């Protein structure tokens, strides 16, 4: 059971290239729970970080990380603390949630993510947001708006070239537009943790934003492919990947941050961006505050 020792499963091109209708997701072990040593979200976030450890993430000094949906019913934020454990010590963590909570982030903003004003461009976006009304399933599974509209605009405007995103989706909490935006990164997948393998949950990963269409994606068809993959793939609940944490911390890559105009972005720059070796954005001081909306 080698896959039990990996942090999870990543959607393969075998299923990315399929052409099927959107079917209902039917998992054999649906909603089964694995006992923890420790909140389950500790193991879920660590396994997400472990998979990102195998991705070409840009890791600069003063790394700008925003974490949406960081709170919980208990008023605490296990995922943010895992991000603190994982990220460089000088990384800037901003987290946010509709409801009040306390966390180990540098900046914590309460309220709807739409109230979160990002003054500059960030390097990594983690979203665990999920709207409770998604459970009121009625008449066919259509693309959702909700916080996905905000996240799509963020990718197009407030994400550094070379930056990455990890955005939680489920069978019914997903967005056509977000899938299609994955074609603007050097690479993309959906990653499902072994700790929560019994859920249709997956983290839609966009690795190294390029600001331009690299892959033309039919977002509706691709979600149908994602569900096709989940329906075809046995996934055993496991946290074996967390037994050896000797190399858990994100590699201190010292990724450079450069300011370039659009005209200067040649093939060399695009190559460096695609390899996780470059970020293009401002290098001022990060300003992320709560906006007063109308």
């Amino acid at each position: 059971a080698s896959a039990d020792w990996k942090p999870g499963h990543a959607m393969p091109s075998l299923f990315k290239v399929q052409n099927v209708n959107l079917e209902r997701c039917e998992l054999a072990n649906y909603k089964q729970s694995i006992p923890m040593p420790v909140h389950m979200n500790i193991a879920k976030y660590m396994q997400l970080c472990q998979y990102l450890n195998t991705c070409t993430l840009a890791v600069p000094a003063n790394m700008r990380v925003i974490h949406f949906g960081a709170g919980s019913d208990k008023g605490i934020a296990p995922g943010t603390s895992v991000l603190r454990q994982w990220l460089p010590t000088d990384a800037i963590i901003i987290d946010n949630d509709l409801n009040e909570f306390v966390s180990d982030a540098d900046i914590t903003l309460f309220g709807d993510c739409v109230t979160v004003r990002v003054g500059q461009q960030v390097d990594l976006v983690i979203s665990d947001m999920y709207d409770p009304t998604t459970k009121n399933v009625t008449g066919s599974n259509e693309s959702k708006a909700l916080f996905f509209t905000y996240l799509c605009n963020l990718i197009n405007n407030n994400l550094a070239l070379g930056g990455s995103v990890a955005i939680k989706i489920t069978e019914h909490s997903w967005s056509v537009e977000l899938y299609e935006l994955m074609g603007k990164f050097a690479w993309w997948t959906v990653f499902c943790t072994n700790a929560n393998a019994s859920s249709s949950e997956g983290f839609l990963l966009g690795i190294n934003y390029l600001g331009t269409i690299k892959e033309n994606i039919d977002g509706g068809a691709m979600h149908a492919n994602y569900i096709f993959w989940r329906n075809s793939t046995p996934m055993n609940l496991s946290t074996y990947s967390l037994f050896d944490l000797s190399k858990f911390q994100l590699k201190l890559k010292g990724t450079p941050v450069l300011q370039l105009k659009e005209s200067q972005i040649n093939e060399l720059v695009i190559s460096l961006l695609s390899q996780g070796k470059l970020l293009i954005r401002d290098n001022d001081t990060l300003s992320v505050s709560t906006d007063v909306l109308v």
């Binding site: 040593p37 208990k74 605490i76 296990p78 603390s81 454990q85 010590t89 306390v102 966390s103 911390q249």
Partner: protein
């Protein structure tokens, strides 16, 4: 939810919490225990987890009564000692991490818990 509202009805939240759990009250739950390689230095508060084999590491904000209860921190600098950092708790005291931090102090020269690691 009961003990947190208890420390909001008094001028000494530290004493109010300690008196509560010393009189049999249930310690505050949902402290964020981390999974760590038990190969750390063992200091009290650290930027990364530093648990030894006899310790467990918690997210700092979650074991701070003033953070958990959303009350003013007593530090004259206004900045919390634990928030944004990791706190090592002796394994025999994980039943009440919030109570442990209120009852103990790190060695200001040595950075280890006095009585739980400090050798000065």
């Amino acid at each position: 939810s009961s003990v947190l509202s208890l420390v909001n009805f008094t001028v000494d939240p530290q004493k109010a919490y300690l008196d509560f759990v010393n009189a049999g009250g249930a310690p505050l739950t949902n402290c964020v225990k981390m999974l760590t390689p038990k190969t750390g230095t063992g200091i009290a508060i650290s930027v990364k987890p530093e648990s030894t084999a006899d310790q467990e590491t918690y997210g700092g904000a979650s074991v701070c009564l003033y953070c958990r209860a959303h009350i003013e921190h007593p530090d004259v600098s206004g900045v919390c000692k634990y928030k944004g950092k990791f706190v090592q708790i002796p394994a025999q005291c994980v039943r009440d991490p919030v109570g442990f931090c209120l009852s103990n102090t790190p060695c200001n020269v040595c950075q280890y818990w006095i009585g739980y690691g400090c050798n000065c």
